[PDB]
Design a protein around this ligand. Structure first.
Ligand SMILES: CCNC(=O)[C@H]1c2ccccc2CN1C(=O)c1cc(Cl)c(O)cc1O
Length: 215
């Protein structure tokens, strides 16, 4: 038989510091792990600013969707928390450069420094995900390009491939498969309080969708 699907998959090694960093974040104990959701919402907001500011000069840039927002989708059945935004998105190359193989100065500094919530300033805030996730999947779609999937369980490497899933119009989808002991962030009350405490100044709509598959 012919496969329902077949696509090339590429594996990349993380730059050495970023990898050392992820182990740091994974194995060590930290107390305000909740700041991961702020870091990821924060990434979404900047992505939303870029598409927004580009549309000002080139209105067709929004042909792939006018609405600028962030959705938070807890799914207790999958034990996943997904952050979805309709920002500018990422090309395949962006995924490879910006999410693993290029380091940046803050990396060596940060590992050595202190409270974990500093990670936002050192520029590598994405990786705070692995405070609560054992695996992170990033689905992204940039205008005029394919939809891509970035994936990592933080073993020193990550994978990129074309995404066969459900088509996004534009933007980025981050899928946190949470550690067994971090399921609290699937909770509406907990999500609401983290957002109110750390993401109060985000100038885009933030909407929760509690997901439950029915029998
Ligand atoms: C990876 C580095 N890019 C960004 O943070 C933002 C960003 C920031 C400034 C300009 C363009 C873009 C595109 N991004 C994304 O597609 C994205 C990435 C992650 Cl990891 C996330 O959680 C949410 C996201 O919307």
């Amino acid at each position: 038989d012919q496969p329902m699907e077949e696509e090339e998959v590429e594996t990349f090694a993380f730059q050495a510091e970023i990898a050392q960093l992820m182990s740091l974040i994974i194995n060590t104990f930290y107390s305000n792990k909740e700041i991961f959701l702020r870091e990821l919402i924060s990434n979404s907001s900047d992505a939303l600013d870029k598409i927004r500011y580009e549309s000002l000069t080139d209105p067709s840039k929004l042909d792939s969707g006018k609405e600028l927002h962030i959705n938070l989708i807890p799914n207790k059945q999958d034990r996943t928390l997904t952050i979805v935004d309709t920002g500018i998105g990422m090309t395949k190359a962006d995924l490879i450069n910006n999410l693993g193989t290029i380091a940046k100065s803050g990396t060596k500094a940060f590992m050595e420094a202190a409270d974990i919530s500093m990670i936002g300033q050192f520029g590598v805030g994405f990786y705070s995900a692995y405070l609560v996730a054992e695996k992170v999947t990033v689905i992204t779609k940039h205008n005029d390009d394919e939809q891509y999937a970035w994936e990592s369980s933080a073993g020193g490497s990550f994978t990129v491939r074309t995404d066969t899933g459900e088509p996004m119009g534009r933007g980025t989808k981050v899928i946190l498969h949470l550690k067994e002991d971090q399921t609290e962030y699937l909770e509406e009350r907990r999500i609401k309080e983290i957002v109110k405490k750390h993401s109060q100044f985000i100038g885009y709509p933030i909407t929760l969708f509690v997901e439950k598959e029915l029998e």
